[PDB]
Design a protein around this ligand. Structure first.
Ligand SMILES: [Cl-]
Ligand SMILES: [Cl-]
Ligand SMILES: [Zn+2]
Ligand SMILES: [Zn+2]
Ligand SMILES: [Zn+2]
Ligand SMILES: [Zn+2]
Lengths: 10, 10, 10, 10
């Protein structure tokens, strides 16, 4: 998945 | 924390 | 993805 | 926050 937590890990 | 995964949980 | 942030969304 | 996405960033 695409995650923004402040920046693909899915 | 503020998280965007596609939207505060901290 | 599987996420735990405290709980599949991938 | 504590995050597990597979691993404290809060
Ligand atoms: Cl979550
Ligand atoms: Cl992570
Ligand atoms: Zn930033
Ligand atoms: Zn969206
Ligand atoms: Zn916090
Ligand atoms: Zn995925």
């Amino acid at each position: 998945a695409i995650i923004f937590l402040a920046x693909y890990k899915a």
